[PDB]
Structures are given as C-alpha cells and as structure tokens.
Amino acid sequence: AAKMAFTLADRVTEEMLADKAALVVEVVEENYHDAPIVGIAVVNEHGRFFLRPETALADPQFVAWLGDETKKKSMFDSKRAAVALKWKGIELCGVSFDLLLAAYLLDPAQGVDDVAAAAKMKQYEAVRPDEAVYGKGAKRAVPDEPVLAEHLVRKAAAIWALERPFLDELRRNEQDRLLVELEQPLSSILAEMEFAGVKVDTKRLEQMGEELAEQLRTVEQRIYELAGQEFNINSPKQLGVILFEKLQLPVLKKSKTGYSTSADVLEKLAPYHEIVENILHYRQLGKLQSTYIEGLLKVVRPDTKKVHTIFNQALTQTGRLSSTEPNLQNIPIRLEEGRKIRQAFVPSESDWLIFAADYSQIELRVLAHIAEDDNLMEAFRRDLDIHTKTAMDIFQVSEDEVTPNMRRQAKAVNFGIVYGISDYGLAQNLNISRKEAAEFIERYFESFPGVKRYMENIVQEAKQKGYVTTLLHRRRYLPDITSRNFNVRSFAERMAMNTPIQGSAADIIKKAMIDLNARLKEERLQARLLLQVHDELILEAPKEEMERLCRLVPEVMEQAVTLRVPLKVDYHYGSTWYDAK
DNA sequence: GACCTCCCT
DNA sequence: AGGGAGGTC
Ligand SMILES: OC[C@H]1O[C@](CO)(O[C@H]2O[C@H](CO)[C@@H](O)[C@H](O)[C@H]2O)[C@@H](O)[C@@H]1O
Numbered sequence: 001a002a003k004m005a006f007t008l009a010d011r012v013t014e015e016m017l018a019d020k021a022a023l024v025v026e027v028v029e030e031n032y033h034d035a036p037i038v039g040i041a042v043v044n045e046h047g048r049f050f051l052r053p054e055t056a057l058a059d060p061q062f063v064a065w066l067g068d069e070t071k072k073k074s075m076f077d078s079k080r081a082a083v084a085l086k087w088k089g090i091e092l093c094g095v096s097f098d099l100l101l102a103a104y105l106l107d108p109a110q111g112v113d114d115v116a117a118a119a120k121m122k123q124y125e126a127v128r129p130d131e132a133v134y135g136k137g138a139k140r141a142v143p144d145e146p147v148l149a150e151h152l153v154r155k156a157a158a159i160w161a162l163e164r165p166f167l168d169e170l171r172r173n174e175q176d177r178l179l180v181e182l183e184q185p186l187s188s189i190l191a192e193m194e195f196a197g198v199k200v201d202t203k204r205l206e207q208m209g210e211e212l213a214e215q216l217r218t219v220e221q222r223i224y225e226l227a228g229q230e231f232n233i234n235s236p237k238q239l240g241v242i243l244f245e246k247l248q249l250p251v252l253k254k255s256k257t258g259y260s261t262s263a264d265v266l267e268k269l270a271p272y273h274e275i276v277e278n279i280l281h282y283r284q285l286g287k288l289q290s291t292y293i294e295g296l297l298k299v300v301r302p303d304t305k306k307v308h309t310i311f312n313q314a315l316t317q318t319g320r321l322s323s324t325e326p327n328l329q330n331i332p333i334r335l336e337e338g339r340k341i342r343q344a345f346v347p348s349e350s351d352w353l354i355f356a357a358d359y360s361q362i363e364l365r366v367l368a369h370i371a372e373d374d375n376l377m378e379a380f381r382r383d384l385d386i387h388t389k390t391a392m393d394i395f396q397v398s399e400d401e402v403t404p405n406m407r408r409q410a411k412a413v414n415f416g417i418v419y420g421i422s423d424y425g426l427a428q429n430l431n432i433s434r435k436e437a438a439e440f441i442e443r444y445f446e447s448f449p450g451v452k453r454y455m456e457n458i459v460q461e462a463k464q465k466g467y468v469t470t471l472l473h474r475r476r477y478l479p480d481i482t483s484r485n486f487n488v489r490s491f492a493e494r495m496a497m498n499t500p501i502q503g504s505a506a507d508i509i510k511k512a513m514i515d516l517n518a519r520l521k522e523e524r525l526q527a528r529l530l531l532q533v534h535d536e537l538i539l540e541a542p543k544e545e546m547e548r549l550c551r552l553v554p555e556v557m558e559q560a561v562t563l564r565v566p567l568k569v570d571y572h573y574g575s576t577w578y579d580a581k
Numbered sequence: 582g583a584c585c586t587c588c589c590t
Numbered sequence: 591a592g593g594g595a596g597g598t599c
C-alpha cells in the first residue's frame with residue numbers, strides 16, 4: 001500500500017489558499033468542545049498538503065482563508081471543526097459541501113460516521129476507517145505524524161473525489177436543495193447553539209442532590225425493613241429473588257435474561273405487598289439522582305457553569321436531531337418532582353430570561369395535511385382539542401359525554417395511529433385485549449377514512465419505490481417491507497406510516513430554526529437559540545426582548561411552511577427553563 | 582467490552 | 591415511532 005503523494009508543509013503557502021478545497025480539521029476526541037485539533041489537510045487544484053495545527057492556526061493568511069466565505073471548502077462533519085475552531089477564537093466560513101450530511105441524506109440507514117463509510121457508498125476505498133487509524137476504547141490514540149498525516153490527506157482526497165458523485169445523486173433524488181439550503185445552514189446554527197451552551201445553576205442541583213440523597217436513604221431502609229433483609233436493589237438477580245421467591249409475588253412478565261421488574265409490571269404487583277411502591281419510588285428518585293443530578297454535574301464546565309451539548313445531525317433515521325453529553329432532549333417534565341430539575345437551567349446573563357416555543361400537535365397536523373382527511377383537517381381548522389374530538393368520534397358521543405377515561409384512550413389511539421401501531425401494540429398500551437384494540441382502530445378509520453387511505457397508500461408506495469419521503473424530500477429506504485416474515489415486514493410498514501409524519505415535522509422545525517436565526521439577525525435582537533427538543537425551540541434573551549419574541553418566534557415557526565391546516569405554536573418565558581411554562 | 586430499565590418527544 | 595444513559599458475564 002504505497003503512500004499517497006503529499007507535501008508535509010512546514011509553513012503555509014499561497015497555493016494552499018485556493019478558492020476551492022477539500023479541508024480536514026481533525027478533532028479526534030469524541031466531544032469536540034475545547035478539544036485539540038491534531039492536524040490539518042488541504043487538497044486542491046495545486047496538490048495535497050498536510051499542515052501542523054500550531055503552524056496553520058497561527059498563520060494569519062490561513063486563518064483569514066478559513067473565515068472567508070468566498071473560499072469554498074468541502075468537509076466531513078464541518079460542525080466538529082467549526083466548534084473546535086470557535087473555542088480557539090477562529091471562524092470557519094465558506095463550507096459549501098459536507099460529506100457527512102450528504103451521506104446521511106442519501107441513506108441514513110448506512111450509519112455513515114466516517115469518510116471511509118461514505119466513500120464505500122461510491123466504491124471508493126483508498127482511505128482507511130478512522131477506527132483502524134485511531135483504534136478503539138482504551139487503545140484509542142493519535143498515531144505518529146507520518147501515519148496521521150497520510151490518513152488526513154487520504155480523507156481530504158476522498159472528499160475532493162466524492163463531492164461530484166454525491167451531489168449528482170442528491171440532485172437525482174431532488175435532495176440537492178435539502179442539503180444546501182436546510183441541513184448545511186442548520187449545521188452552522190447548531191454549531192452556535194452548542195458553543196453558546198446553557199447555563200446551569202449548579203448550587204441548585206447540589207442541594208437537590210442533598211435532598212434526594214436523604215430521601216433515597218429513607219426509602220432504601222424502608223425497602224430493607226419490608227424485605228426483612230439487605231440487598232442490591234439495582235441488581236436484577238437479587239431483586240427478582242426478593243420479589244418472586246422470598247415474597248412469592250406472581251410472575252406476570254418474564255425477560256429473556258430472567259424476571260421482569262419493569263415499572264409496568266411492578267404497578268400491578270403493588271396490591272400484593274408494600275415493598276413494591278417503595279421500590280418504584282426508589283427507582284424514580286435514583287433515576288433523578290444518578291442521571292440528572294450526578295450526570296449533569298459531571299458534564300458542567302466548571303469555568304463557565306455551562307453544559308455544551310453535541311447535536312448529532314446525522315444519526316436518526318427520520319431526520320430528527322439527537323443530543324449527547326448531556327442529552328438536553330430528555331430532561332424530566334412529566335412528574336413534578338423531576339420537572340424541578342429544569343429550575344437549574346438558567347439564563348447565561350443577568351436580566352435575561354428563558355423563552356420556550358413549541359408546536360401544538362405538529363405530527364397530527366402534518367398527518368392531516370398529508371392524508372387530506374377532511375374530518376381531521378376540519379378539526380384542526382377549528383383548533384379543537386384533538387383527543388376530545390377523537391373520543392367523540394370513535395365513541396359516537398357529544399363533547400359533554402366524553403369522560404376522562406374516554407379521552408385518555410382516544411389519546412392513546414391517536415399516538416398509535418401516528419406510530420402506525422396495530423391491535424397488539426395498542427393492546428399492551430391501553431392494558432386491553434387485541435380484539436378490543438382492533439375495534440378502536442376500526443372505529444378510528446371510520447371517522448378518519450383519509451388517514452386509513454394514507455396508511456394503505458404509503459405502505460404500497462414504500463413497496464413500489466423502495467422508500468418513503470418527507471415534505472422536504474428526506475428519504476428512508478424500507479427494504480424489509482417485502483420480507484415474508486410477519487414481524488419484520490410489519491415493523492417496516494409502521495416505519496412507512498410514521499416516517500413521513502415524524503420526518504416532515506423534523507423538516508419543518510429545521511426550517512423554522514433557519515428562518516428564525518435570519519429574523520433574529522435582521523431585527524438585531526440579542527436573543528439566542530439554545531436548544532431544540534423535536535417540536536420546541538428554547539432561547540434566552542434580555543428581559544427587554546420578551547414582548548417582541550412573543551410575536552416573532554411563534555410567527556416564524558408557524559409560517560415555516562404552509563400546510564392544508566394552520567400550524568400553531570404556544571410559548572412561555574420565565575427566570576428558568578422550569579418557569580418557561 | 583459486549584449485552585441486557587427509564588427519561589424525553 | 592424516534593432517541594440517550596448500571597449490572598452482569
Ligand atoms: O453526526 C455527528 C457526529 O457523529 C460522529 C461520527 O460522524 O460521531 C462521533 O461524535 C459524536 C458526538 O460526540 C459521538 O456521540 C459519537 O459517538 C462519535 O462517534 C461525529 O463525527 C459527529 O460529530
């Protein structure tokens with residue numbers, strides 16, 4: 001395997017600053033925030049170059065070239081490079097092609113997470129997987145200069161070679177604008193969000209942690225008093241023995257490994273013995289303690305008291321974002337004791353406030369749009385309570401005859417319809433029988449014949465084309481749709497049904513983010529985007545901007561696309577994330 | 582290092 | 591429907 005030719009440069013030259021280049025700014029640490037850049041490579045019309053970061057990033061011409069938006073770069077995962085460079089006070093501009101995002105749009109099922117995996121999609125194999133170069137786990141390391149340098153230049157050369165074929169394919173798929181006008185500009189916005197971060201009131205979490213520690217100690221002792229002995233409550237072997245052998249509790253669910261102690265199961269066992277509610281309480285508290293007190297405190301930067309998440313923009317199969325380290329998309333809200341964690345998330349400057357705007361029922365509104373179901377579209381045109389309306393229809397009752405249990409069940413059905421669910425899975429959910437579940441679904445489709453039609457038509461389209469699409473032309477390939485195995489085919493069908501709804505919702509909120517960022521700038525507001533949680537945007541702004549944000553944010557979000565039904569956005573603000581309710 | 586419950590939308 | 595994050599072996 002003969003080396004690829006390149007200049008191991010000792011200094012930056014003019015021919016390295018062409019107005020078109022593939023660029024590699026390598027950040028090997030997974031978490032790129034304030035992380036080292038271990039090397040640089042540039043491939044352009046004049047050749048291939050490796051530069052050492054301490055050289056290139058001290059060179060004013062290079063830094064200016066980095067920041068010049070008329071000097072176009074092709075990269076893989078530009079957000080990583082962008083953020084790492086922001087921490088060093090350097091702006092990266094002019095990124096006109098991101099191979100990671102191109103690969104993700106073409107097929108999110110491939111799990112492209114390095115240049116080698118993207119290149120393999122076009123039968124290009126003259127580059128190694130990062131894992132082969134860096135190793136894995138405790139053996140992970142930056143290799144010596146000649147090996148590192150060759151690797152970065154090969155990645156750059158791959159990018160240079162693969163841009164045209166990736167773009168041609170995106171174009172054939174009508175995904176070219178989706179890359180260039182949505183995902184790439186979103187990438188910059190997300191880079192700013194991650195860099196800005198979110199301020200944490202660590203003292204507040206620590207005293208929450210102190211309280212929890214005390215309450216956990218109390219319940220733990222109670223559990224041991226009720227069990228008549230001590231044991232590792234978090235050990236599935238030990239607990240299963242206490243519950244199902246020593247205390248003779250019925251076994252309602254098994255798990256391949258052993259006895260199920262899932263919360264759905266424990267709830268049914270609670271009548272039999274007082275230990276059960278205490279174990280549940282213990283789990284709720286321990287979850288908060290371990291994950292959202294301890295876990296959060298571990299990743300707060302002590303110098304700024306901020307958490308800086310990383311939004312994985314090229315992971316989920318539907319076009320949603322994900323968030324890591326910490327995950328700021330699963331902060332408790334459902335139960336009050338856990339929701340109080342949100343009080344620890346505070347504005348980053350004094351006299352600023354948190355502002356949260358969320359779409360109201362975006363998935364069902366999208367479904368109404370794509371199905372063209374007359375009844376559902378009317379329901380949203382009237383701005384009805386959708387679950388109450390759905391109860392009225394499937395039970396054939398007047399609004400005044402809808403009971404709370406009726407509403408709750410219509411709500412579960414609505415979620416089921418959205419997730420493409422079937423008699424069995426709705427059964428599990430409503431704690432009812434398969435045949436009953438099947439009658440609900442049948443009643444649903446009688447009231448919403450357009451949605452039935454859609455569910456039928458989309459599964460057939462998935463079979464005929466091999467994939468389904470979203471509003472903005474995101475794509476998901478569903479080859480299991482023709483499996484002769486019921487369970488595998490059926491999962492594929494649900495995906496066929498759900499992906500255009502979940503994915504189109506993701507598309508809309510991504511566009512809103514772009515539109516919003518543009519409006520914020522035009523208006524010269526200091527308001528800034530901090531977070532996205534699938535159907536909601538969280539910002540922080542001076543107290544003096546709230547009144548304008550109240551009008552501006554919902555409007556931008558509501559007007560992002562025009563559907564057959566209105567989009568509706570609710571909003572709140574307050575001293576903390578908790579209070580923005 | 583791999584494999585196997587509970588938090589969010 | 592999508593995700594992220596301690597015991598056992
Ligand atoms: O797609 C964004 C993200 O994906 C990569 C690989 O493409 O994944 C690494 O980085 C993320 C962010 O910390 C980690 O969660 C993941 O485990 C890593 O493999 C990375 O390059 C991008 O930043």
Ligand SMILES: [Cu+]
Nearest residue numbers: 585586595596
């Ligand atoms: Cu786990």
